[PDB]
Amino acid sequence: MLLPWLILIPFIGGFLCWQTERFGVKVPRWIALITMGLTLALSLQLWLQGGYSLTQSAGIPQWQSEFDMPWIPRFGISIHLAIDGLSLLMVVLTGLLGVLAVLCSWKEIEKYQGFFHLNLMWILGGVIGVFLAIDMFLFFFFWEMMLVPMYFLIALWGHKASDGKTRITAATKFFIYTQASGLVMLIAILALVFVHYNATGVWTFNYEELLNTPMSSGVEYLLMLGFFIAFAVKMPVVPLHGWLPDAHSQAPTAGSVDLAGILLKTAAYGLLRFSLPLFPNASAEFAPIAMWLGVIGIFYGAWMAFAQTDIKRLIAYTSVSHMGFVLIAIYTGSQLAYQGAVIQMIAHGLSAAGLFILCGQLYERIHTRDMRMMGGLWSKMKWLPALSLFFAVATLGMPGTGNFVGEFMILFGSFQVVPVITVISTFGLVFASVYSLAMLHRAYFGKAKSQIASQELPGMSLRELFMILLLVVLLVLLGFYPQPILDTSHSAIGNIQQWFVNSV
Amino acid sequence: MNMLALTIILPLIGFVLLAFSRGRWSENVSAIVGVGSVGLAALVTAFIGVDFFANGEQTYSQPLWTWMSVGDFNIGFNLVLDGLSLTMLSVVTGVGFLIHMYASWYMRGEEGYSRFFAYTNLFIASMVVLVLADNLLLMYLGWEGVGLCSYLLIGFYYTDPKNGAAAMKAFVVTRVGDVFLAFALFILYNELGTLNFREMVELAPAHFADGNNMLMWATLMLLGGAVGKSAQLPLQTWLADAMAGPTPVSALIHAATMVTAGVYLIARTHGLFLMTPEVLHLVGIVGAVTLLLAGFAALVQTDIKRVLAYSTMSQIGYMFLALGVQAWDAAIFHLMTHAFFKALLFLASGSVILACHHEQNIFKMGGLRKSIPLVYLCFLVGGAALSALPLVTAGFFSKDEILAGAMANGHINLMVAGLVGAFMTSLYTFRMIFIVFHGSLPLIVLLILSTFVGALIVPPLQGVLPQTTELAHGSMLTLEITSGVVAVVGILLAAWLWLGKRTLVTSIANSAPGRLLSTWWYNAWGFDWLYDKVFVKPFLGIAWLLKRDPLNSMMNIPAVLSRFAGKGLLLSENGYLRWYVASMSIGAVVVLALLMVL
Numbered sequence A: 001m002l003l004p005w006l007i008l009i010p011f012i013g014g015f016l017c018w019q020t021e022r023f024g025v026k027v028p029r030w031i032a033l034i035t036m037g038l039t040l041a042l043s044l045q046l047w048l049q050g051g052y053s054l055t056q057s058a059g060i061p062q063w064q065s066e067f068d069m070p071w072i073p074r075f076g077i078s079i080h081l082a083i084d085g086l087s088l089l090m091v092v093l094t095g096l097l098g099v100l101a102v103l104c105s106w107k108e109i110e111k112y113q114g115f116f117h118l119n120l121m122w123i124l125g126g127v128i129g130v131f132l133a134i135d136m137f138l139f140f141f142f143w144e145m146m147l148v149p150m151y152f153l154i155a156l157w158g159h160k161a162s163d164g165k166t167r168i169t170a171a172t173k174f175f176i177y178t179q180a181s182g183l184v185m186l187i188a189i190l191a192l193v194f195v196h197y198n199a200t201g202v203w204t205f206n207y208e209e210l211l212n213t214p215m216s217s218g219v220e221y222l223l224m225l226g227f228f229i230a231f232a233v234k235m236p237v238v239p240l241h242g243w244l245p246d247a248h249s250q251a252p253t254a255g256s257v258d259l260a261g262i263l264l265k266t267a268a269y270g271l272l273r274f275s276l277p278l279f280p281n282a283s284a285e286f287a288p289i290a291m292w293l294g295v296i297g298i299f300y301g302a303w304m305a306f307a308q309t310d311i312k313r314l315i316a317y318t319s320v321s322h323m324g325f326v327l328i329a330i331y332t333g334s335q336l337a338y339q340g341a342v343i344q345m346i347a348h349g350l351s352a353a354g355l356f357i358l359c360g361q362l363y364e365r366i367h368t369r370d371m372r373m374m375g376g377l378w379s380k381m382k383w384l385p386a387l388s389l390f391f392a393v394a395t396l397g398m399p400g401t402g403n404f405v406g407e408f409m410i411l412f413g414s415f416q417v418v419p420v421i422t423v424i425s426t427f428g429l430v431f432a433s434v435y436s437l438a439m440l441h442r443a444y445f446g447k448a449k450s451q452i453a454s455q456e457l458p459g460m461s462l463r464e465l466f467m468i469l470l471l472v473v474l475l476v477l478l479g480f481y482p483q484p485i486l487d488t489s490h491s492a493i494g495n496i497q498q499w500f501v502n503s504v
Numbered sequence B: 001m002n003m004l005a006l007t008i009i010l011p012l013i014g015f016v017l018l019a020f021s022r023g024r025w026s027e028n029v030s031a032i033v034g035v036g037s038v039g040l041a042a043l044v045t046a047f048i049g050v051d052f053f054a055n056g057e058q059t060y061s062q063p064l065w066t067w068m069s070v071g072d073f074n075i076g077f078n079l080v081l082d083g084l085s086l087t088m089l090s091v092v093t094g095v096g097f098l099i100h101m102y103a104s105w106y107m108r109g110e111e112g113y114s115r116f117f118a119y120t121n122l123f124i125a126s127m128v129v130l131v132l133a134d135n136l137l138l139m140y141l142g143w144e145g146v147g148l149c150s151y152l153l154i155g156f157y158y159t160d161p162k163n164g165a166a167a168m169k170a171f172v173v174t175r176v177g178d179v180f181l182a183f184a185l186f187i188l189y190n191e192l193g194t195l196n197f198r199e200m201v202e203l204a205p206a207h208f209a210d211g212n213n214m215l216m217w218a219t220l221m222l223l224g225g226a227v228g229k230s231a232q233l234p235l236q237t238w239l240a241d242a243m244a245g246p247t248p249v250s251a252l253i254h255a256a257t258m259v260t261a262g263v264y265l266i267a268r269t270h271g272l273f274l275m276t277p278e279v280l281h282l283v284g285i286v287g288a289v290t291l292l293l294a295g296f297a298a299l300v301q302t303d304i305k306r307v308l309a310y311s312t313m314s315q316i317g318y319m320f321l322a323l324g325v326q327a328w329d330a331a332i333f334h335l336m337t338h339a340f341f342k343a344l345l346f347l348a349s350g351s352v353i354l355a356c357h358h359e360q361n362i363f364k365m366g367g368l369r370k371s372i373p374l375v376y377l378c379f380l381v382g383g384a385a386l387s388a389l390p391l392v393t394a395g396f397f398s399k400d401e402i403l404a405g406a407m408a409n410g411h412i413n414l415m416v417a418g419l420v421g422a423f424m425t426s427l428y429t430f431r432m433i434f435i436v437f438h439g440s441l442p443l444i445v446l447l448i449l450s451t452f453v454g455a456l457i458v459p460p461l462q463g464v465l466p467q468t469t470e471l472a473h474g475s476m477l478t479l480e481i482t483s484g485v486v487a488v489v490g491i492l493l494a495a496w497l498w499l500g501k502r503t504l505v506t507s508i509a510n511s512a513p514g515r516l517l518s519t520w521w522y523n524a525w526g527f528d529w530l531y532d533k534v535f536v537k538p539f540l541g542i543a544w545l546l547k548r549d550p551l552n553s554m555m556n557i558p559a560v561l562s563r564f565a566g567k568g569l570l571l572s573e574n575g576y577l578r579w580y581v582a583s584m585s586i587g588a589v590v591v592l593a594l595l596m597v598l
């Protein structure tokens, strides 16, 4: 019953943020901070109230908290929300990243900050609705509504150092990719619904009603392929990955925008929630192709991330490689690999958020993103080089940070099922360390290759230091004590894996 | 003994305090913080050892918390303490404390004092985690901590790029070794179902009754990880390259912490290697080959730090040779003695470097045995300990134990490699001493410890490791006198060739085969060249090829096709009415014909 308010509270908060811009320029940032405070507090209240640590696995479906309302009775379509351990973890991470976003755009005294904030909270509400909703029309609607404000910020508020045509091109590329793949997802959903209606005789778009359908081999493969195409371009999965670094490099320079819209963990959530339980035989047949696509994505993203002179593009390719690791984890059919995928997803979100915030602050210091004009910044800047080194240590899979834990549980489960892809992926982790060290050598260590790095630069203020240190503390706690996160999502992972492997 | 985790906590506390100090503190207070943190770790280690010897020499387990638990996968944060772990912890903490106070005296007037002490504190904490881990995964955490501290500490002077490039090379090869170790971990879980050392040992013979192939893979994979960290074959190409860094960190890597980790793995996982004796003989073969190649490489080196790096390379090869011939106690004794005298050697080398202010090669140095008496004495006794001088040093006893373990198990060829390597080691350390020198409290402590006083101390390895087969008294007598004779023959040959006018040296060095051998051995048998031309250069080429993002253009190809088709179709909108009427007539013809054919 609290899930509709979880979705709408960012929307009404953004509405008051837009309406309160007449009261003052510095007003809507506070209102956005309070409504993310209520969103995060309600998510933590659901975490403490649901009782997730001692929850048994009752099979699919087993929802901790559900809400039902009719939306289109003609098609039998409901606003149907359902939260479990995995969705709760994603919602908590989403609210945390929204708080970090509203903190990272605190120094904007622009004339139209109200619409920027409004689009930010609408993005946050859209991704929260993606995580919470299980009805396929509502899931698709949230999936596609979280695109328009993000496209508007990339096109309008983006990288001021570049021309407007480049921002227009990047925003249009991202929106075209995501929306066309959403249309393919809608075709798959519609075909599944029509087959269920032909087999039974009931109009329903609900998730639990569509699982028990007579699925002929060849049609189920096509439905799974459409779902995987959408969740693969939005993961990203190669070659459907060209929009991610274009959207990152032409994003607004505050760094809030990358935390809000691009850093979604929704594609692998859809893979675990929709692609695997609805199509067990199709995914069982398709698993070698998806795992080899994950291998190609990992090594390709490492090879791009070594060869980029732009740091934001480099971190985008880090995201590509880590989501390729998660893609390898999804189609293995192991509980250990799934828990590792969840841990790696949360750790990648935190580490990439810290790297993006530090990159934005660094660009505010030196007024350039090109890594060839900077060097020896350890002796010129106060706090940022050390924290950036910590986050690049985290992003290569270092113990004491959750990325090592997530990747290693992924590889343990994979080697339990497939050995060769595991060993090739672990060599991919060698390449991950290679590009992380290359970025640290090309950015912070060496001699000053220009004049902007030859002068002493101002240090970070208390707010950016506090949010970066909070991210550091959460990364250390996740790396050293990942147990509560594991028992939080032990039930939904158990149900999904049991539905995947006891059905074949 | 209940304060076992304090040896982890106190270096961590020192690292956190010195990292968040950010150099605002004075050199004095930062020196107190770092030196006191390592000293409290060493004192806690001494109290743990006293209580361990006062409780009957029994293993102890301290489970702090559990790390992860999914079904059958239970990994915990448990510390363990037996004789091997106590020996490793004691030598690491003691040598680290001596090196830390030497660095407190040494690193004065340097930017990054608190940062250097923070990195070395985190290195000590990672090594304590490495030596006090009950399972393989906490051991892997200490492994990665050791690697990251190596990267952060080798490239300490970030101003010059060769230090940074060397640190990246060291971290890359050690991460490749980490990947080999991770393969070992995955195989050991998938076969045995646990990562606890004792549980793996007791459950290994029950599961591998019908087939001993996957255990063979696991032991080979652990061997790959060990040769990754210990700079052995074939992952040895980081030691001399990364040895451009500062002096106390150099002594800390070579003496106690880093290069001994693979030796600790081979000694700790001794049972699993015992059910796969072919892999253990491979360990011995790799160690023998690496020690001979290290002697050949250090034969022609011209820098003191490179000579000492290849000398440590040869000593780790000696330890792996001891491990391959089922002489574990000899290997750990050699580990402790080598830690002591290599720490002494590197501290003396740094004293020489700061006395001459520059890294001058050995041929530009001469007559220094009268300029500095104390440094000459310390470097002499360290070189004598490394050369295994009989009846006065401890490395002599350690190598004698190693060769006795080789003899009594039946490894004649590995023994021949051992005596040849002893000849090489004595010859190259005193060729370096005779070139350099002819033509205070940590130093005193290490000078005492590098003598037979260090041979008096015996590790309590009884009851944790199997007993090496003791040699017969007559055969041990012949082995001892043979090792002594070969050693002193090496000393006399180095004295004959390098003390006077080097006439027989430059005659064969200037020959074309002699210069070819010198160039081959100066670059460590051409292994760096091979690793650039086989692994680095294709990686750079693929990166340069792929920097255009070809898949992005391949998926942008439909956009280009759509634009071209749209501009082609826009040519039909020329604006002529008669063409429009003709187009309607053409469409009518096409529609009528299509209806007629169907």
Ligand SMILES: CCCCCCCCCCCCCCCCCC(=O)OC[C@H](COP(=O)(O)OCCN)OC(=O)CCCCCCCCCCCCCCCCC
Pocket (backbone or CB within 6 Å): A165, A168, A169, A172, A173, A176, A177, A180, A181, A184, A229, A233, A240, B555, B556, B558, B559, B562, B563
């Ligand atoms: C897994 C494969 C099978 C399933 C596929 C499902 C479909 C969704 C996933 C694939 C989507 C591919 C989209 C490729 C184009 C992305 C957008 C892009 O690159 O735009 C570039 C360009 C605008 O940028 P700019 O350079 O500023 O324009 C010049 C101005 N004259 O754009 C333009 O100038 C015009 C752009 C027109 C719209 C894009 C082209 C669509 C063509 C139909 C594609 C259908 C799917 C085909 C199979 C996948 C591709 C091989």
Ligand SMILES: CCCCCCCCCCCCCCCCCC(=O)OC[C@H](COP(=O)(O)OCCN)OC(=O)CCCCCCCCCCCCCCCCC
Pocket (backbone or CB within 6 Å): A378, A379, A381, A382, A383, A386, A387, A389, A390, A393, A398, A399, A400, A472, A473, A476, A477, B008, B012, B016, B018, B019, B020, B021, B022, B023, B112, B114, B115, B118, B122, B125, B126, B129, B141, B142, B144, B145
């Ligand atoms: C199992 C036991 C452990 C075993 C070993 C575990 C190893 C794995 C963990 C590795 C952790 C990261 C290691 C690398 C840290 C890199 C950052 C660093 O060292 O920064 C040093 C820097 C001071 O540099 P300095 O030259 O003095 O500055 C003057 C000019 N700015 O410092 C600064 O500028 C300020 C500080 C920057 C950040 C320092 C590190 C933060 C992370 C650790 C503490 C987190 C907070 C403590 C609570 C955690 C949760 C309980």
